[PDB]
Amino acid sequence: VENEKSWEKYFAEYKVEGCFMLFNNSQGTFKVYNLERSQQRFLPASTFKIFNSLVGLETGVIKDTSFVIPWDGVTRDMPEWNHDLSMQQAFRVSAVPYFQEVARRITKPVMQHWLDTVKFGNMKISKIDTFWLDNSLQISPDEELGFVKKLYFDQLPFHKVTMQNVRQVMLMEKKPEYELSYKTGMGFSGPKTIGWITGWIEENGHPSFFVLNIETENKSLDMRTVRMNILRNLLTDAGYFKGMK
Numbered sequence: 001v002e003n004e005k006s007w008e009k010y011f012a013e014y015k016v017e018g019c020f021m022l023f024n025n026s027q028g029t030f031k032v033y034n035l036e037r038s039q040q041r042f043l044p045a046s047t048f049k050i051f052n053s054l055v056g057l058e059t060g061v062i063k064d065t066s067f068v069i070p071w072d073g074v075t076r077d078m079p080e081w082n083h084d085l086s087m088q089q090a091f092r093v094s095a096v097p098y099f100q101e102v103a104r105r106i107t108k109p110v111m112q113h114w115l116d117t118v119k120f121g122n123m124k125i126s127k128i129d130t131f132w133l134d135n136s137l138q139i140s141p142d143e144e145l146g147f148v149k150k151l152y153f154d155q156l157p158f159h160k161v162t163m164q165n166v167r168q169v170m171l172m173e174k175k176p177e178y179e180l181s182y183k184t185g186m187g188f189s190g191p192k193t194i195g196w197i198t199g200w201i202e203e204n205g206h207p208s209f210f211v212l213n214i215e216t217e218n219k220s221l222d223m224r225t226v227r228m229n230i231l232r233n234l235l236t237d238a239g240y241f242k243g244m245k
């Protein structure tokens, strides 16, 4: 593990705290800003959709990535969500109600079995449809990094087609120079807003795994935009987006 202290630049620019972890498979380099935070636990918020999708597909609650759960007719603050959505659409717009219904169909005893089998964070369920957003379940950035690396390499205890389907829906940006796959998250913990982006970037078929975790006590900061700007600035600094990795 190399300590990359210059990455503080991109967090200080937004007056936030955070860590960044970057594992470049092909060059065998592993860089981390804020090692202490990388070992601290936080609620996963919407990054848990990776796990929920895996278990939903594996148990067969979700038939395939086109599987539709209708809108329940409850109008929510995000217009994207007030529709009948396929798994792929719900994942990409981060539609919480889709995955709350997945969790209820999985059921708490089955969910607990899969948390325990994968050894996912503190493995703690409060309520079946809130536990990844209400600060009961917690996971560290280093744990999220290990999890997505195992997902990429088919090392989790799921069927290969289950894991291929989740990798496919995680693909968010594709150019000839790079393919960027990730899941974002945002949650609340005490006075703090916690932001996540977990995923990988592939250039020439070579993956680099990353986890970004940020926090602020400034209630007026736009975490949704700031987390993405910070990720793009960090990966640009590290030499990505040009097809050279």
Ligand SMILES: *C(=O)N1C[C@H](NOS(=O)(=O)O)CC[C@H]1C(N)=O
Pocket (backbone or CB within 6 Å): 044, 045, 046, 047, 093, 094, 095, 096, 133, 183, 184, 185, 186, 187, 224
């Ligand atoms: C997940 O963290 N959430 C669902 C939704 N989209 O989040 S994302 O942009 O982080 O993927 C809004 C934020 C958050 C929530 N409020 O539950």
